[PDB]
Design a protein around this nucleic acid. Sequence first.
RNA 1: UAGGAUAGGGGCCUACCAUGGUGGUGACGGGUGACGGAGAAUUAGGGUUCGAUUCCGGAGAGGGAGCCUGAGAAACGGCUACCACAUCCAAGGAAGGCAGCAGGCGCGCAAAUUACCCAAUCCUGACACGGGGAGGUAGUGACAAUAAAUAACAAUACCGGGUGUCUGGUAAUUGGAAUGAGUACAAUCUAAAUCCCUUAACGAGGAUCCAUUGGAGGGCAAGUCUGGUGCCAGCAGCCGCGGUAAUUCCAGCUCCAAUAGCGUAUAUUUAAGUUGUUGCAGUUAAAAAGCUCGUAGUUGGACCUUGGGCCGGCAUCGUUACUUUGAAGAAAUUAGAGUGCUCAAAGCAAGCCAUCGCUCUGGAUACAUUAGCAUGGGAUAACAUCAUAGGAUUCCAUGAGUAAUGAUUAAUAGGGACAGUCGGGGGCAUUCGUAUUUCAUAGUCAGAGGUGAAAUUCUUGGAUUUAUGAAAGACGAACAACUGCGAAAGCAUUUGCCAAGGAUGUUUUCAUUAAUCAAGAACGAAAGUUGGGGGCUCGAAGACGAUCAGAUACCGUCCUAGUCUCAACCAUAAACGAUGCCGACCAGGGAUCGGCGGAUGUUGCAGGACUCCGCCGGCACCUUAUGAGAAAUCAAAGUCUUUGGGUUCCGGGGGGAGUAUGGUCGCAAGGCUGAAACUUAAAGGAAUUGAC
Lengths: 98, 129, 149, 139
Amino acid sequence: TFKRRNGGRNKHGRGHVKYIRCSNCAKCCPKDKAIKRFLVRNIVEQAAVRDVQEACVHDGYVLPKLYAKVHHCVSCAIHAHIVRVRSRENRRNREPPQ
Amino acid sequence: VRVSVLNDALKSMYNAEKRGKRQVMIRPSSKVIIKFLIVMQKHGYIGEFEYVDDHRSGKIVVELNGRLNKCGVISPRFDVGVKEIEGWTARLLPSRQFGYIVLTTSAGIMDHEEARRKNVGGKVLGFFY
Amino acid sequence: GRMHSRGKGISSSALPYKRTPPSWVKTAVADVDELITKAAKKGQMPSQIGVLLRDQHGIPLVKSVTGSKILRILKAHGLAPEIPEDLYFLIKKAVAIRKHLERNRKDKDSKFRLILVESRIHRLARYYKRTKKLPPTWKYESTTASTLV
Amino acid sequence: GKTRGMGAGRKLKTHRRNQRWADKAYKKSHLGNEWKKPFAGSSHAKGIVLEKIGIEAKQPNSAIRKCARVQLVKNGKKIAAFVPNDGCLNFIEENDEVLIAGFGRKGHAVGDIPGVRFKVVKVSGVSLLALFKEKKEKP
RNA sequence: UAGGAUAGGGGCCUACCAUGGUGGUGACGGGUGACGGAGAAUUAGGGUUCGAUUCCGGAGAGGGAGCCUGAGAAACGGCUACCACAUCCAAGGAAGGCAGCAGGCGCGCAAAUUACCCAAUCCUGACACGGGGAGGUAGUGACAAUAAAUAACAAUACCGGGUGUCUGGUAAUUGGAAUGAGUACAAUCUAAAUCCCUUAACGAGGAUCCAUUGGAGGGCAAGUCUGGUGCCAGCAGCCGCGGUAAUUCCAGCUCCAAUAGCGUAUAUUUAAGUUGUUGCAGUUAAAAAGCUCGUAGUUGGACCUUGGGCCGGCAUCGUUACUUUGAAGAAAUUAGAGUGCUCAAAGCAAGCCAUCGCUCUGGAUACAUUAGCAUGGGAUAACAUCAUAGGAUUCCAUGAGUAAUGAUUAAUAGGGACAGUCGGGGGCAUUCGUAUUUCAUAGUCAGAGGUGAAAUUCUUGGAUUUAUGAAAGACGAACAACUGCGAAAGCAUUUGCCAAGGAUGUUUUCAUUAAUCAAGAACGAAAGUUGGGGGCUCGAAGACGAUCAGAUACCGUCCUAGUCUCAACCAUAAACGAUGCCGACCAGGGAUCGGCGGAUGUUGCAGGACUCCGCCGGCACCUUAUGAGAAAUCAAAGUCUUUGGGUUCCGGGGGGAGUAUGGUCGCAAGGCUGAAACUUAAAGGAAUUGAC
Ligand SMILES: [K+]
Ligand SMILES: [K+]
Ligand SMILES: [K+]
Ligand SMILES: [Mg+2]
Ligand SMILES: [Mg+2]
Ligand SMILES: [Mg+2]
Ligand SMILES: [Mg+2]
Ligand SMILES: [Mg+2]
Ligand SMILES: [Mg+2]
Ligand SMILES: [Mg+2]
Ligand SMILES: [Mg+2]
Ligand SMILES: [Mg+2]
Ligand SMILES: [Mg+2]
Ligand SMILES: [Mg+2]
Ligand SMILES: [Mg+2]
Ligand SMILES: [Mg+2]
Ligand SMILES: [Mg+2]
Ligand SMILES: [Mg+2]
Ligand SMILES: [Mg+2]
Ligand SMILES: [Mg+2]
Ligand SMILES: [Mg+2]
Ligand SMILES: [Mg+2]
Ligand SMILES: [Mg+2]
Ligand SMILES: [Mg+2]
Ligand SMILES: [Mg+2]
Ligand SMILES: [Mg+2]
Ligand SMILES: [Mg+2]
Ligand SMILES: [Mg+2]
Ligand SMILES: [Mg+2]
Ligand SMILES: [Mg+2]
Ligand SMILES: [Mg+2]
Ligand SMILES: [Mg+2]
């Protein structure tokens, strides 16, 4: 019984693809199969930005961002609620949320 | 590779017939294809068809009238005598009332009833009904 | 598709239906014959003679103006090469591959291409033997092949 | 798939000849091992009652099948033969003369009896059926 | 080549000479519970299995060998010898051959009389005449097979259907008639007897002149009747039944099927489209080789007589397959015409006026693969033949003519060339980067590390942390995609070199050169092996800490082989798209990569970037069957009982088992090829409802 048409990965027209290591368990997962996310956040959050504003020496200092591309294996992604288990008909829905 | 142009012609014609098309194109053409089509048209299973000279192998445009149920070749071209025709009739045809088997006898390309009339045998090209 | 690949490309030429040469061609058969003979004297070959005729001298197709193919013209004039062009170029390519592969023993991809080109060479040689276009004693010797070209 | 050339008769014949061997029945018949069985390709056989035994019927059944360990006189092999028709174990005695037959499944165990492929047909030249129905008496 | 020998050819044998002969189109060798054929069984067709036996051919007389006589024998109801048995005997010797008929022993699951006769069919001899265990006749015979009894009718009693009558059915009721099984004069049969056919006399009422074999849960026609047993005895081909109410066991009654036949065991035909040429299968059920090349094999584009109507000679020639017609073709068997053996299975007989006979009475006819011989046909196919004219046609015994002078086209087959490109395709050298570790310098001081929580470990000799710098090895983030290249494995920093490749463009070239492929070859992740180097990180083995009833595991730390590289071996992966390659056709759509054609109007710049349309090639994706499929699902896994485009590999219920052994490659680990005994009624696939 074939759960998915693409087999759970994104490989077509090639035979090999180098792996990566899950950021939580360090498990080798093929690069296309791994659940990849790009998270961009303030260094200090809303409760902190207020207290760091006046503490800044000059008002022209824009607060710096941080960007991180993280990869998760299927087990870690499911356990961390990054991706849930979907229904059989909703599995094919590749549209991102919002 | 293209090992039997007759099979390609008959298969394309049958596929177009099932889809309700009114014309079909056959490429490449050949004399045996023309003779098979002539037999089918004479018995009233197809209509007009014209050969187009492309200076290399020729094409055929055939007009369908909806009367052809199935048509197909037999491979390899088995040799049948006059006494074996009945047996093949019991195999390739729906019933003894109608249907046709095409034989390439040494007197030319004809149907099986004509071969029985002339009392001649030969190889089997195909069938249509 | 391709004999020694998985390609299915169909790019080629399409000769016109009109077999007669076009009206604007005002070159006699003698001029074309002399040009072909001179080119064959200059070490050219039928494939690369036809293109020179097509481009510089405005001859769309030799078989139309002169009524015969380039190879037939050369053979009638006796200037035809001793080896067919396609086999000559296949042998040249195989010789180049062997010369390169001599110094690169770990380049195990040109060895595969060498096997392929040798297979093509042998098939073409067998065909040319069947039609008496090569001596029956002909044989492709890899070591002495480079001396031929 | 298949080779359909008119010149390919040898290929089809050889392929079928090779592939007949996967058949269970054909391989059983044409391997020649049927001659190494105790009956050696015979419908019946004759033997001497070595002893009288009972075998517990296989699960989920629960009974004691009254068999008999006998020895064939044609090759000396020792086989167990079933004794049907309740009370017919009494007719069989020691070192007695019996006619044995197959059980019905052509070299396969029949019923819940573990590993028994023969049944006793005659004893001392008298059929078990005649003794069972009191038509004949043991001599 | 020449002899010898033979009835005769021939290495049949001899002398000399030469090195040949057969083989993946299976030689050689092995097995056969193998005499070959005509034929037998079952058969929609195709087929599968059998063929000791009465007809034909061969071989043998216990096993081998040698030979006489004879026209014919390597004869055995002839001899000689040896081997093995075995027979008398006066112990000096003598005689043997039932796989002839009958009979005996033995072997076995398994097979009849030590009878009569030449009357028939024929054979043999000097012969009309003898003889014939050839052959026929009787005996035993449920091998197989044909026909066919075991009662029919009426009345009465009882009960039904079209108050009534008729019809129809049951009674160890009542009547009569009928007859052969049996017995037997007699005749007939017969070589003589016997059987049959025919027939005096006798011969049926419970017409005792007495029908049996298997079953009664399902498959599968027939009982949820009664009594017994109580997971025992037993039944049960398979599913299953019996544990105090048994429709299944043991019995009675009743009923069912076949019926003078039925049950059981083996072998095998069908069933079996589960051997599949007709006609099966290979994504997930067993089954596409890791991938490509490759000889034999199989398979190979198109093109060349049509209009023409009518309707004894005499040559010398492309070869075949195919198809038609003919001939020759043993009988018996099969199919089949005739024929009233009383019918039938049979037989080849017979039939008729009522004969001193006739129908000339009949004793037909097919089929009989393949191979061989001959006649006609030339569509479809296979071979070589095809442009140095070395071509065709003329003149010059009894050199000049000469002509229409002679070459199919260039596959949306293939190869080669050329042009501008394109790619993380390959080899070599070279360049860069942060991080990790180590070391060096400098700064501060109490913990650091790791964990769900801790400890093993480091540390006031300064651990962890901070900054600078050098060295080493590995690794190439982000860019990175339902994107690219490669035969697959696989391939991701720059630059140079070297050879290769697809696609596109082409009014370039050759002209079938092709597709797939036993044998045979290249390449083939990771781990593994032999040595040299390197040895940062990570880390099988090992050690320690922790958890735990236990922990040789999961969690921590230190680490060996290994991970990197060079020269050689191995040849396997969930080597996967679980989907071999080539070709044609059959829905739509948009996106994307490479090339090309056109339009278009912007760029701090013809061309490049962008937009729009179209063509070819590729990786994919979405919707929908009118398709397919057990379904999941698939635009191919479609064009399949309306079954056939070519070709390779490969599967036959689950285990045993990819095991044993042999062969073969490897240093080894191992790889390729690869069973059997035995065991089992299910194993398995997809989907559904519950439960968890
Ligand atoms: K994914
Ligand atoms: K001779
Ligand atoms: K004589
Ligand atoms: Mg699952
Ligand atoms: Mg690709
Ligand atoms: Mg892979
Ligand atoms: Mg001689
Ligand atoms: Mg000699
Ligand atoms: Mg024998
Ligand atoms: Mg025989
Ligand atoms: Mg006999
Ligand atoms: Mg005989
Ligand atoms: Mg003899
Ligand atoms: Mg004997
Ligand atoms: Mg003898
Ligand atoms: Mg004798
Ligand atoms: Mg004799
Ligand atoms: Mg018997
Ligand atoms: Mg009963
Ligand atoms: Mg019933
Ligand atoms: Mg009861
Ligand atoms: Mg099957
Ligand atoms: Mg499975
Ligand atoms: Mg499978
Ligand atoms: Mg594959
Ligand atoms: Mg053809
Ligand atoms: Mg990078
Ligand atoms: Mg790319
Ligand atoms: Mg191979
Ligand atoms: Mg494998
Ligand atoms: Mg584009
Ligand atoms: Mg199996």
